[PDB]
Each structure stands twice: as C-alpha cells, then as structure tokens.
C-alpha cells in the first residue's frame, strides 16, 4: 500500500527468496547506496459468488531499509513473511530520504528486475 512498487504475486507454494546481490527493484532516482531493502508478504480474503470466503495468491511488497511496516527491523532479522534483499555495495542505513508512498500523490512504480535475475518457482510477472 505504502510501497513505491507493485507487488510480486506468489502463484505456487514456495515463498519469495533471492540469492545475494539480487531482489532490489530498479529505481532510476535512487543511488547505489539506496539499493537495499526488504519484502513483506500479504494475503487476501475474497468472497466469491458462492457466498464463501476464498484465499487469493499472496503478494509481496518491497520496502526500502528502515522504512515501511517493519521500519524498526534491522537487516537480516529473521521473521516469517519478511525477506531481505540488497545489491552489493549498498549501505545499511535507513533510507528515510526515500520514505514510503502516499497513494494520493503518485502511483506505484512497476516492479522491474534486471535481465539475469533468478526468481524462484511460482514467481513471474
């Protein structure tokens, strides 16, 4: 919701993981120091025409380090539903100069990963 980027839908059964040096969405207005953050999982409850609640595919939202719902979580703090990503050469500093997004101000950036990025099974745009 407050994320600057769109979500990464989880279609299969495995969770979102990235090897070291990958996972950070591309941001032209950010510096190589900024390319470091985390993802956060969210599930949805829908009510089909059957009148019965149904669970939809979980989605993951990127948040720069020190920002978002887990702004007070150090990098690497193990917690279910939160995974961490970083580009080699990025500082471990909360990027409050980037902040979160206000849905009344601008739209979410289309989450794009560079060519050569490895995505786990069940993850595709």
């Amino acid at each position: 919701t407050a994320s600057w980027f769109t979500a990464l839908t989880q279609h299969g059964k495995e969770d979102l993981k990235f090897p070291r040096g990958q996972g950070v969405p591309i941001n032209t207005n950010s510096s190589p120091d900024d390319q470091i953050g985390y993802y956060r999982r969210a599930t949805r409850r829908i009510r089909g025409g059957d009148g019965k609640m149904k669970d939809l595919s979980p989605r993951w939202y990127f948040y720069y380090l020190g920002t978002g719902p887990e702004a007070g979580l150090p990098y690497g703090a193990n917690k279910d539903g939160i995974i961490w990503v970083a580009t080699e050469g990025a500082l471990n500093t909360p990027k409050d100069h980037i902040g979160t997004r206000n849905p009344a101000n601008n739209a979410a950036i289309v989450l794009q990963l560079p060519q050569g990025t490895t995505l786990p099974k069940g993850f595709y745009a």
Epitope: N29, A71, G99, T100, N102, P103, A104, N105, N106
Partner: antibody
Framework: QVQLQESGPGLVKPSETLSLTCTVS????????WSWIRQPPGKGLEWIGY???????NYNPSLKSRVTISVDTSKNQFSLKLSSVTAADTAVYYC???????????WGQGTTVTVSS | QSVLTQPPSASGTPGQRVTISCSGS????????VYWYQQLPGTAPKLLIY???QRPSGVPDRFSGSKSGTSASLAISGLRSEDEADYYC???????????FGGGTKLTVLG
C-alpha cells in the same frame, strides 16, 4: 461522519511560537495523512505539512526551518508548532486528511490566527 | 518551475463551458497526480478532482479534469451561477518533497 475542528490561540506576539491543534471526531487518526494548510486574508492557500504512520513527517521546505507537527493517537488529535512567527504567518489555519487516493478530502473550519504586539 | 501558475481570474456565460489552466514543471505535474479544489467565500476548500481526472462522490459531473505534459486543466460544462468561487490546483513536488498549490483563479458567472 468524519469532522475536523481546529483549536488554539487567536493571537500570538511576533517572534513567539504558534501552537494549534486539530481534533478528529467521527473517525480515528489510524494510518491517514493529516495536514495543516494556511491562507492569509485575501491570498492563496499554502501547504504546511502533514503527519502519518509512525509519526513520519513532510514539511514545506519554505517553512521547514520553523515548523513542527506532532500527533497523539490517544486523544485522536494532531498539532502544529510554528516558531519565530512573523506577520507573514497571520492567516486562517486549516487541518485536513488524505483518505487513500483522495487528498485533503475533509477540511476543518479553519481558525483565524493573527501575529501582532 | 517549482510552483503552480494559474490565471488570476476567469468568467463565462451560464449554461456553457469554461476551463481553468494550471502550469507546472516535471517535478510536480510532469511526474505526480493533480488535484483541484473549490473555495466558496468564507468556507474551506472542497475537493473537486483527484488523480488527475477522478470525481469524488457528490461533485457534479459537469466538473472535469485532465493532465498532459506539465500542465493540467479543470473543465466546467453547463456553467451555473453557484459555480462562482475560487479554484485551486495542487500537486506533489519531488524537488521540494512537499505539496504545492496554485495561485488560484477567481471565477465569475454572468447573466
């Protein structure tokens, strides 16, 4: 249902500090953005700043040197603090709320504050 | 630019169409949403348009907004004497990291 109401001083000596607060009835602070807007008599609107989740802030850089906005989730209120007030700070001060994609969708009545000795 | 520039005044014949302009830079209009507000005398501003062209509930459908490039426009069809008010455009600014208003446009309905 949501209604806003500003309250505080109606007059503040120059070089002092303006301190207004806005009380939210009909809803909660929650995760919404709560702004402060001022308008001098006969002039245009000027955005001061807003506060939101985790008390995070954004200020107009023109007033950033002197402005401080706070929030109190318990009292369902948020306040404005403007220091070293000059005559250019005499205006009607509004509080507003950003409801997701609708910015400043609900405004308060606006309280008139004048800076004079 | 880093501010929004509107014409200071405008007027039109009732029952017809009139538009108000709003000029900005790539740091505000050229990159973020534009929203419009109406301020009747003695009252607080009222949201007319959000997300460039979306209408909140209660706003008459004769109000219409648009944006292209670094400019935005507010169109009012079927002008009515009750539309006589001040109109403000506003948008987020990445350079200032803050919200910026336009000067405002005095609308005068005739007849």
């Amino acid at each position: 249902q949501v209604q806003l109401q500003e309250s505080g001083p109606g007059l503040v000596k120059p070089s002092e500090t303006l301190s207004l607060t806005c009380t939210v009835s009909g809803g909660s602070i929650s995760s919404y953005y709560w702004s402060w807007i001022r308008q001098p008599p006969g002039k245009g609107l000027e955005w001061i700043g807003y506060i939101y989740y985790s008390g995070s802030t954004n200020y107009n850089p023109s007033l950033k040197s002197r402005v401080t906005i706070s929030v109190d989730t318990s009292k369902n209120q948020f306040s404005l603090k403007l220091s070293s007030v000059t005559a250019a700070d005499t205006a009607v001060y509004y509080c507003a709320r950003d409801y997701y994609q609708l910015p400043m969708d609900v405004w308060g009545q606006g309280t008139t504050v004048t800076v004079s000795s | 630019q880093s501010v929004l520039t509107q014409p200071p005044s405008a007027s039109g014949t009732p029952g017809q169409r009139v538009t108000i302009s709003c000029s900005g830079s790539s740091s505000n209009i050229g990159s973020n949403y534009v929203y419009w507000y109406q301020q009747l005398p003695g009252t607080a501003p009222k949201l007319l348009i959000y997300r460039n062209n979306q209408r909140p509930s209660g706003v008459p459908d004769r109000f219409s907004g648009s944006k292209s490039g670094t400019s935005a426009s507010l169109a009012i069809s079927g002008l009515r004497s009750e539309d006589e008010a001040d109109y403000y455009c506003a948008a987020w600014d990445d350079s200032l990291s803050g919200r910026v208003f336009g000067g405002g446009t005095k609308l005068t309905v005739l007849g």
